[PDB]
Design a protein around this ligand. Structure first.
Ligand SMILES: CCCCCCCCCCCCCCCCCC(=O)OC[C@H](COP(=O)([O-])OCC(O)COP(=O)([O-])OC[C@@H](COC(=O)CCCCCCCCCCCCCCCCC)OC(=O)CCCCCCCCCCCCCCCCC)OC(=O)CCCCCCCCCCCCCCCCC
Ligand SMILES: CCCCCCCCCCCCCCCCCC(=O)OC[C@H](COP(=O)([O-])OCC[N+](C)(C)C)OC(=O)CCCCCCCCCCCCCCCCC
Ligand SMILES: CCCCCCCCCCCCCCCCCC(=O)OC[C@H](COP(=O)([O-])OCC[N+](C)(C)C)OC(=O)CCCCCCCCCCCCCCCCC
Ligand SMILES: CCCCCCCCCCCCCCCCCC(=O)OC[C@H](COP(=O)([O-])OCC[N+](C)(C)C)OC(=O)CCCCCCCCCCCCCCCCC
Ligand SMILES: CCCCCCCCCCCCCCCCCC(=O)OC[C@H](COP(=O)(O)OCCN)OC(=O)CCCCCCCCCCCCCCCCC
Ligand SMILES: CCCCCCCCCCCCCCCCCC(=O)OC[C@H](COP(=O)(O)OCCN)OC(=O)CCCCCCCCCCCCCCCCC
Ligand SMILES: CCCCCCCCCCCCCCCCCC(=O)OC[C@H](COP(=O)(O)OCCN)OC(=O)CCCCCCCCCCCCCCCCC
Ligand SMILES: CCCCCCCCCCCCCCCCCC(=O)OC[C@H](COP(=O)(O)OCCN)OC(=O)CCCCCCCCCCCCCCCCC
Ligand SMILES: CCCCCCCCCCCCCCCCCC(=O)OC[C@H](COP(=O)(O)OCCN)OC(=O)CCCCCCCCCCCCCCCCC
Lengths: 98, 70, 347, 96, 80, 105, 318, 169, 99, 104
């Protein structure tokens, strides 16, 4: 198929493995999540513009709005974690092991 | 008095006058003494590319009228 | 929380589940999961302690990852089909990604690793919502995509969910983690029969929701979050020990109870399709679930653990808790096996 | 004032659109002859190139139907120069 | 309804102007005589091509030419 | 649990964005409108199991309309053979594939 | 030939920014019963040249930075955005005649707060970062009313095209149907550029602007000239947007002189507002946005949605 | 080179995702995602999605990454091996993919992909006096009634949800 | 079942509430030091609010009223012009009335 | 392509002026100068999230000048006034539960 679709899929998998392998921060996890969303936006837009399928032109707007509201919810969770512990480190969020 | 600010306002006004007058004269120079063809929609680009093909000299702004038909 | 805000947020959770159930467009499916997650996050943070914030953060991360994989599966479906109908998928890669995403939304193993922690970190009513109501939307999407679901993938997820939900609860003394590992095992049981007969999937889902709602309603009525606090029920409310006895003997699949009905109908439909080894391994693995159920019954009803002196003050006070549908949910989770051919209404 | 002027602007838009509509049959005829010219030239150059390849069907449809399929950008501007390619494939997008 | 309105126009005139402008925006197209003409102008704007019809023999209301009398006219748009 | 509330109440919530052959704004046709219409009118009413085998040709034409993989593979073969004949010197490009012919309309 | 057009755009931008400093000091001089510069050049005309040569050889300030690369990129991004906000401006013809020039300018001005945020990250002060956060919150606050006022005005335009906005105002200035949007727009563009009475970084009501404080900052001249490019640009955009002039297609210089005179009067109006009022407290302009402008902006947004439908005055798309 | 402009922008997009996905810091992670959003927006702009590209700039980079940097300025304190090693690993993998698909004109990692430029797959038609993408986005109001209902309800619930969970009581 | 690995696991609290496990102090100065210029303030800020404001003075303490002790009355008069240096003849008049 | 040339020229002029302003004051060799977590505010984060949520509501409002051109004007006017009303109700709930406090 289209050569640019390979790169946008590989970008989604790169941001996936970034999100699927944490280093320290929850903010970097949310950045990898929104990079995944960015690659989803670009790939959906390239398909819908390529197809000349008219009514799905409003679909990437809905994706962007819903997932940025999702991102605001994630930043509020990060803010409550940082208000609890002082950092946004993922190793401070291990009380639920026992 | 208050008119002592008018040289600086005049220099600033000439500096604002240069870009628009410059792009108007460049659009008239680059397009056969006329305005630049505004192609916001694909029909306007379709007609513009048709003009580029029918002029023969690979220029959209070379207009062929009734002298071109028999 | 403001009760007006609580009512609107619970209506928004229900509305997201309804939008997943009734819509014919993949973007509306994704919208419904986004609405469901976005509304259920304050239900988890109702008490505002660090464990609820940790549980809500882990739940957000897992459901967000699942939602993005779901949208990627939808996007590959739009590649290879040019359309949006919620039906079978037109690519096995999109089928694998959507099966992984719905397994993450269910908390099936190996994506089960959030369910005991997130269930432990949140209150019992929100844990009830997470372990009963949130199972309805991804099982509906799995119900509509089953012509495209890979057999080996969903059966691997099912047997791994049954085995891990069996060996998980054997070490646990927290009641919410026991209910979470029971959730993992029962979601394995539900998806194991999905490609064979999804009416038995709906039967297992309904009977499991009734039994889980019974157990969480008993835990809310007794205000017990540990095994050892559930043990002090005999000196306070002795009927509740009988109810947790019959409900935990139900959830272990013992006849003549109604929790025998789902796994018996699942073995009944999988051996129609010439699978003998797989439901036998499933049935032998369910003995671990029944083992920690029997551990709970021994600690609560069949013995009497020693109590403290302050229970004498609570003898003088009755329960003012609105135990909504607890007798109805107790009767329907124990004495429904004579009505086993009622499953045809789900066809 | 904006009521009078936007009603006049809508009348002027309908005048421009009906000029477009009156010109569309001629442009459709020229575009039909354009794409058939380019496909016939691509077919002739395929006939003079794809001889050494064994089992090649010149002008073979990649579709199983015999319905006319709208030509793709590579199906028209594929064997041509890259300047013509760019002017047909990013001309309107890059235009000013 | 009279003393409260004067009190809130004294205290918070910004919000009174806001709810007044918003309320007129809501209820005024239902009382406007020109709302029909917006619909009529938007459906009379020819973005596409008026694809002709095969004259089977009996279509008296469809013209044979743009300048024919029968057909949807725009005298109301020129005149108003 | 596909509770088909839209067909029960008769309301249309999301059937319009569902396919490319639906009623588009200003009657804009999609690039695979005919192929998707043929595949849908083939596969309608006969179910998925009969639609995977009895509507395979319309589905293949519609997939090859969407992705254009056979077309790009054919153009790869033609361009590769053309570049090989340029490399072997046994071929010269025509004046209408060089930019020296003043195009049709 | 097109590069000549790009240079005749972007070099007179820098010259107009240089002499806006002189016009500011002179007009604030005479409005304060004094004079501005008149010694350095004839009538002070060599003041900006002298001041730019002074600032370009003055020592890098005292300290070092937290992030070096963002300390480099914040003036680069500020100057790049301040020069690329001009390219769709129709005067009477834009440089890049794009179909969505309004939305392009709103998007590139939404990108402008990263220079503030990266200059806050770059300085080693934990207090200058707080001041940068306050300025970022101020700017993204007033971007809301920028977007909604701009949308409400373009409901009478028909498109996002800036060149169509000259065609729209051929019968009347668009300040006459939309003067409340115009006055809230003018104050909101005044609050975008951190301009008085809303300049809290360059004034008091600030935790870090405090006499023997830390925070290595960049070359002040580059942020200063990006800021004045933004000021002149937003005044030309307001002139195009509300006070759009007469355009003869055969004589473009009439429209060019006309929008130039209106843009000069509107930039002098910025200079005349900053020399007339005390500064807001930070919560007072947060109040001014969220409890004064945004209710009226939403009310007028509903009004300018429903008004072309009830007047049958819907503008055309093309 | 100019015919492959969308491919070059896509390679810069993948390089940017490798840049921040290796996660040097949330600050430089945000910077890398900003540059990635810009080049992916350029990818979208070069097919004719002008409104959707300006939605990237205005909404994604203009609001959301501004809020991510705003929150990162309130989380971390200002002043490796795994980051740089994973960066050069992803760069080697991506340039090996580029070299393979440029020397072979067909590659199969998960799906088959063409080696020519993506200019071939466009349409040879015109839309008239409108952008089709603009009209399909304008149809959010007339056709997309239920979509606007659920999106506005989700945003109002999002406001209520953020005010509930950040209150701390 | 405790192991060698899961030996450090204490059981969770009863109400699932853990113990939570400050305010800004600012040294202040006037922005442009032309009007006051010699003011020092130690703040205790609480975000926006001010909890404690401690002015530190003596930065223009010159020991005027010890220098007066070694000078005559006519010599002590010009020290009063320099106390409130926008109120010169008022302080002159006050010292004049005292003498 | 004209846009990319213009952006490249603007970025090059910006980088050139930054290179001047970082290397030109190093020509005059000066002396070697030898002598020698932030408090989190909930209100700053809340005004940032309030911006982000209302900016998403603006992102819904942005196709209105094109949506006025439709033929389903009753539906379009209803959904337009409904989106601006939901933005107003979002602002009202942000008001009355003391969300807009001390950054009002
Ligand atoms: C169709 C499916 C319908 C399923 C049931 C729907 C209702 C339950 C869900 C909503 C809910 O929680 O309601 C509370 C719920 C009571 O739950 P609770 O808190 O556990 O009550 C315990 C005590 O009764 C609390 O006592 P109290 O002092 O507070 O007041 C006494 C109360 C006072 O009574 C009233 O107030 C009723 C009169 C007013 C009616 C409404 C007027 C408006 O009496 C009762 O409620 C008696 C119990 C009523 C029956 C409960 C079970 C119903 C059937 C459940 C499904 C069974 C399926 C079997 C299938 C087997 C094979 C699979 O129901 C009611 O209060 C009203 C019941 C109405 C029954 C209608 C049956 C026909 C439906 C068609
Ligand atoms: C574009 C060209 C220029 C445009 C004009 C701008 C040039 C003039 C600039 C003057 C200097 C301003 C310097 C900055 C000042 C900042 C402070 C300020 O003004 O705050 C704004 C003040 C703020 O209010 P306030 O602070 O004065 O009041 C106190 C408010 N409370 C009680 C909440 C504390 O006012 C506004 O917000 C008004 C904004 C514009 C109002 C538009 C009115 C439209 C009315 C239509 C009719 C309504 C009647 C009812 C409906 C009838 C329907 C038929
Ligand atoms: C276009 C926008 C405006 C651009 C800027 C304005 C244009 C002019 C820019 C250049 C100005 C002159 C050079 C920089 C200033 C040097 C001043 C100075 O004291 O330098 C001392 C320095 C060093 O002098 P020094 O060695 O005596 O230093 C003594 C100081 N201590 C003891 C502390 C070290 O001079 C130089 O290094 C000379 C640099 C080159 C001078 C010009 C060469 C020819 C260029 C043609
Ligand atoms: C709260 C919801 C208020 C608005 C309700 C719908 C208003 C409207 O314009 O509906 C007609 C519109 C459009 O209908 P229509 O009349 O334009 O249909 C003509 C057909 N088309 C559009 C193809 C030209 O929506 C529907 O009919 C279906 C969507 C809304 C269904 C009801 C939603 C209720 C939500 C409750 C929560
Ligand atoms: C096989 C699965 C992985 C595929 C990619 C492998 C790349 C090489 C790295 C191997 C793992 C190295 C490592 O230590 O990973 C852990 C690290 C997070 O841990 P950190 O805190 O950085 O360091 C302490 C060590 N645990 O993890 C990371 O830093 C992960 C960063 C992810 C970014 C992915 C970029 C693209 C990689 C190639 C394509 C996939
Ligand atoms: C769009 C338009 C933009 C315009 C931008 C610029 C605006 C201002 C234009 C210039 C205004 C007038 C400048 C006059 C400066 C003073 C000249 C002068 O008298 O300098 C005297 C000085 C010493 O001379 P000395 O020989 O000692 O004299 C004693 C004789 N008994 O001798 C000297 O200092 C040496 C000579 C210096 C001459 C400097 C002239 C001004 C240079 C400004 C730079 C930009 C100029 C414009 C460029 C574009 C247009 C050409
Ligand atoms: C194909 C299937 C389609 C779908 C079919 C139906 C599926 C049903 C799924 C049931 C999910 C139940 C989720 C929990 C109940 C919902 C309402 C709720 O949130 O109730 C909790 C509420 C909160 O009160 P609060 O004050 O917060 O309590 C904590 C102490 N202060 O109040 C309390 O905490 C009070 C304590 C008792 C609450 C008991 C609630 C039981 C609800 C479930 C009933 C059984 C399901 C219906 C019958 C079977 C249907 C299949
Ligand atoms: C119906 C059409 C659609 C209507 C919805 C669309 C509205 C568009 C404008 C958006 C406004 C968004 C924010 C609205 C918040 C309203 C609530 C409010 O602000 O209440 C608090 C306020 C007192 O404020 P306080 O608590 O003291 O705070 C310090 C400020 N000084 O309390 C007050 O100031 C009292 C405010 C209520 C009384 C106002 C009465 C106005 C009547 C105008 C004439 C009739 C117009 C017809 C429609 C009426 C609708 C109510
Ligand atoms: C820290 C990093 C560095 C920071 C400093 C530098 C970056 C920030 C400042 C520059 C921002 C660059 C923005 C580039 C795109 C702008 C949007 C755009 O292209 O809009 C114009 C136009 C859309 O309008 P329309 O008229 O519909 O299209 C033509 C149809 N006849 O569309 C067109 O005309 C399309 C023209 C072709 C496509 C142009 C694509 C440019 C290349 C990709 C982006 C490069 C910049 C990457 C970084 C961005 C910011 C992070």
């Amino acid at each position: 198929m289209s050569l640019v679709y390979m790169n946008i899929m590989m970008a989604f998998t790169v941001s996936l493995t970034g999100l699927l392998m944490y280093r320290s921060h929850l903010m970097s996890s949310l950045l990898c999540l929104e990079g995944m969303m960015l690659s989803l936006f670009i790939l959906a837009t390239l398909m819908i513009l390529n197809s000349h399928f008219t009514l799905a032109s409003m679909m990437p707007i809905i994706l962007l709005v819903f997932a940025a509201c999702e991102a605001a919810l994630g930043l509020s969770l990060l803010v409550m974690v940082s208000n609890t512990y002082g950092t946004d480190y993922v190793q401070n969020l291990n009380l639920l092991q026992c | 008095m208050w008119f002592e600010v008018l040289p600086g306002i005049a220099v600033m006004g000439v500096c604002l006058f240069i870009p628009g007058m410059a792009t108007a004269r460049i659009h008239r120079f680059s397009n056969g003494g006329r305005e630049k063809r505004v192609a916001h929609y694909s029909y306007q680009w379709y007609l513009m590319e048709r003009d580029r093909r029918v002029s023969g000299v690979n220029r959209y702004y070379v207009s062929k009228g009734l002298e071109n038909i028999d | 929380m403001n009760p007006i805000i609580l009512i609107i947020i619970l209506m928004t959770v229900m509305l997201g589940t309804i939008i997943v159930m009734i819509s014919t467009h993949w973007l509306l499916i994704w919208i419904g999961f986004e609405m469901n997650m976005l509304a259920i996050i304050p239900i988890m943070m109702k008490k505002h302690n660090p464990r609820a914030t940790e549980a809500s953060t882990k739940y957000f991360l897992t459901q967000s990852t699942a939602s993005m994989l779901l949208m990627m599966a939808i996007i590959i479906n739009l590649m290879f089909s040019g359309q949006w109908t919620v039906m079978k998928l037109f690519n096995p890669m999109a089928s694998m990604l959507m099966t992984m995403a719905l397994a993450m939304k269910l908390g099936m193993a190996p994506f089960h690793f959030w369910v005991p922690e997130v269930t432990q970190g949140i209150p019992l009513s929100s844990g009830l919502i997470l372990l009963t109501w949130q199972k309805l939307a991804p099982m509906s999407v799995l119900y509509q995509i089953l012509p495209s679901i890979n057999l080996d993938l969903i059966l691997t997820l099912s047997i791994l969910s049954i085995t891990i939900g069996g060996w998980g609860g054997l070490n646990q003394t927290q009641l919410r983690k026991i209910m979470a590992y029971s959730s993992i095992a029962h979601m394995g049981w539900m998806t194991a029969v999905l490609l064979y007969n999804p009416t038995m999937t709906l039967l297992n889902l309904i009977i499991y929701i009734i039994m889980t709602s019974t157990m969480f309603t008993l835990f809310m009525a007794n205000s017990t979050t540990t095994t050892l606090s559930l043990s002090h029920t005999w000196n306070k409310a002795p009927i509740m020990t009988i109810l947790v006895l019959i409900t935990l003997l139900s959830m272990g699949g013992l006849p003549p109870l109604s929790g025998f009905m789902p796994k018996w109908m699942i073995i009944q439909e999988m051996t129609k399709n010439d699978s003998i080894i797989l439901p036998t391994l499933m049935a032998i693995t369910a003995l671990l679930n029944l083992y920690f159920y029997m551990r709970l019954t021994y600690s609560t009803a069949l013995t009497m653990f020693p109590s403290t002196n302050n229970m004498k003050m609570k003898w003088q006070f009755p329960t003012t808790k609105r135990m909504t549908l607890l007798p109805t949910m107790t009767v329907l989770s124990t004495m429904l096996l004579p009505l086993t051919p009622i499953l045809s209404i789900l066809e | 004032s904006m009521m009078r002027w936007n009603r006049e602007r809508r009348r002027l838009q309908i005048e421009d659109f009906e000029a477009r509509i009156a010109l569309m049959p001629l442009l459709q005829a020229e575009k039909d002859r354009r794409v058939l010219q380019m496909l016939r030239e691509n077919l002739e150059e395929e006939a003079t190139i794809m001889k050494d390849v064994p089992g090649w069907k010149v002008g073979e449809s990649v579709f199983h139907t015999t319905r006319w399929v709208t030509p793709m950008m590579g199906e028209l501007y594929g064997l041509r120069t890259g300047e013509e390619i760019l002017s047909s494939t990013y001309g309107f997008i890059w235009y000013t | 309804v009279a003393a409260f309105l004067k009190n809130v126009w004294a205290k918070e005139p910004v919000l009174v102007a806001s709810f007044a402008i918003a309320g007129l925006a809501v209820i005024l197209p239902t009382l406007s005589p020109y709302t029909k003409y917006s619909l009529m102008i938007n459906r009379a704007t020819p973005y596409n091509y008026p694809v002709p019809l095969r004259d089977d023999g009996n279509m008296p209301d469809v013209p044979s030419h743009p300048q024919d009398p029968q057909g949807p006219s725009l005298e109301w748009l020129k005149r108003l | 649990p596909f509770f088909d509330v839209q067909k029960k109440l008769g309301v249309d919530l999301d059937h319009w964005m569902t396919i490319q052959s639906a009623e588009q704004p200003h009657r804009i046709p999609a690039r695979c409108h005919a192929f998707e219409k043929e595949w849908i009118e083939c596969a309608h009413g006969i179910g998925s199991i009969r639609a995977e085998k009895e509507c395979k040709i319309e589905f293949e034409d519609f997939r090859e309309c969407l992705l254009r993989q056979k077309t790009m593979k054919r153009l790869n073969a033609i361009k590769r053979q053309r570049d090989k004949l340029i490399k072997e010197g046994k071929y010269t490009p025509p004046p209408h594939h060089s930019g020296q012919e003043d195009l049709r309309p | 030939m097109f590069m000549i057009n790009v240079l005749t755009l972007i070099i007179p931008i820098l010259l107009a920014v240089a002499f806006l400093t002189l016009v500011e000091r002179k007009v604030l001089g005479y409005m304060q019963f004094r004079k501005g510069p008149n010694v350095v050049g004839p009538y002070g005309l060599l003041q900006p040249i002298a001041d730019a040569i002074k600032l370009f050889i003055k020592e890098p300030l005292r300290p070092a930075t937290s992030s070096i690369s963002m300390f480099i990129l914040a003036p680069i991004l500020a100057l790049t955005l301040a020069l690329t906000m001009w390219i769709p401006l129709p005067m009477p013809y834009p440089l890049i005649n794009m179909n969505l020039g309004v939305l392009f300018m709103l998007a590139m001005s939404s990108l402008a707060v990263y220079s503030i945020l990266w200059s806050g990250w770059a300085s080693n002060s934990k207090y200058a970062l707080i001041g940068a956060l306050r300025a970022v919150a101020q700017t993204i606050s007033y971007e809301v009313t920028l977007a909604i006022i701009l949308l409400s005005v373009l409901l009478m335009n028909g498109s996002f095209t800036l060149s169509t906005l000259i065609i729209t105002q051929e019968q009347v200035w668009l300040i006459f149907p939309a003067w409340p949007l115009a006055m809230m727009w003018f104050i909101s563009t005044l609050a975008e550029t951190n301009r008085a009475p809303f300049d809290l970084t360059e004034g008091e009501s600030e935790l870090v602007s405090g006499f023997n404080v830390e925070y290595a900052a960049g070359p002040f001249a580059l942020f200063f000239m990006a800021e004045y490019a933004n000021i002149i640009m937003m005044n030309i955009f307001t002139t195009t947007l509300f006070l759009g002039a007469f355009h003869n297609p055969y004589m473009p210089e009439l429209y060019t002189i006309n929008f130039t005179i209106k843009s000069l009067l509107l930039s002098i109006t910025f200079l005349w507002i900053r020399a007339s009022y005390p500064r807001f407290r930070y919560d007072q302009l947060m109040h001014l946005l969220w409890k004064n402008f945004l209710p009226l902006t939403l009310a007028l947004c509903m009004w300018h949605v429903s008004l072309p439908i009830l007047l049958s005055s819907i503008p055309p798309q093309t | 080179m100019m015919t492959y402009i969308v491919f070059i922008l896509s390679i810069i997009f993948v390089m940017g995702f490798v840049g921040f996905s290796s996660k040097p810091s949330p600050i430089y992670g945000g910077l890398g995602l900003i540059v990635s959003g810009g080049v992916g927006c350029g990818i979208v702009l070069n097919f004719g999605g002008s409104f959707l590209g300006l939605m990237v700039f205005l909404i994604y980079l203009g609001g959301m990454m501004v809020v991510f940097g705003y929150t990162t300025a309130m989380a971390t304190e200002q002043y490796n091996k795994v980051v740089l090693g994973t960066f050069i690993t992803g760069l080697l993998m991506e340039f090996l993919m580029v070299y393979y698909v440029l020397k072979d004109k067909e590659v199969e990692i998960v799906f088959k992909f063409n080696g020519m430029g993506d200019w071939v797959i466009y349409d040879t038609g015109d839309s008239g006096f409108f952008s089709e993408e603009a009209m399909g986005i304008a149809a959010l109001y007339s056709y997309g009634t239920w979509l606007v209902i659920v999106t506005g309800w989700s945003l109002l619930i999002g406001v209520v949800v953020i005010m509930e969970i950040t209150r701390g009581n | 079942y405790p192991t060698k690995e899961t030996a450090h696991w204490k059981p969770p609290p009863w109400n699932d509430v853990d113990p939570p496990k400050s305010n800004l102090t600012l040294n202040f100065g006037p922005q442009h030091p032309a009007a006051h210029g010699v003011l020092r303030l130690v703040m205790e800020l609480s975000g926006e609010m001010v909890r404690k404001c401690d002015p530190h003075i003596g930065l223009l303490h010159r020991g005027t009223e010890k220098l007066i002790e070694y000078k005559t009355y006519l010599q002590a008069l010009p020290y009063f012009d320099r106390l409130d240096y926008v109120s010169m003849m008022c302080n002159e008049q006050a010292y004049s009335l005292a003498v | 392509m004209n846009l990319m040339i213009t952006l490249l020229t603007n970025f090059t002029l910006a980088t050139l002026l930054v290179t001047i302003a970082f290397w030109l004051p190093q020509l005059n060799v000066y002396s070697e100068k030898t002598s020698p977590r932030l408090p989190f505010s909930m209100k700053f984060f809340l005004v940032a999230i309030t911006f982000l949520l209302f900016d998403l509501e603006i992102a819904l409002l942005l196709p209105l000048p094109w949506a006025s051109q439709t033929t389903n004007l009753n539906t379009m006017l209803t959904m337009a006034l409904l989106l601006i009303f939901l933005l107003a109700v979002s602002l009202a709930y942000e008001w009355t539960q003391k969300g807009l406090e001390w950054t009002e």
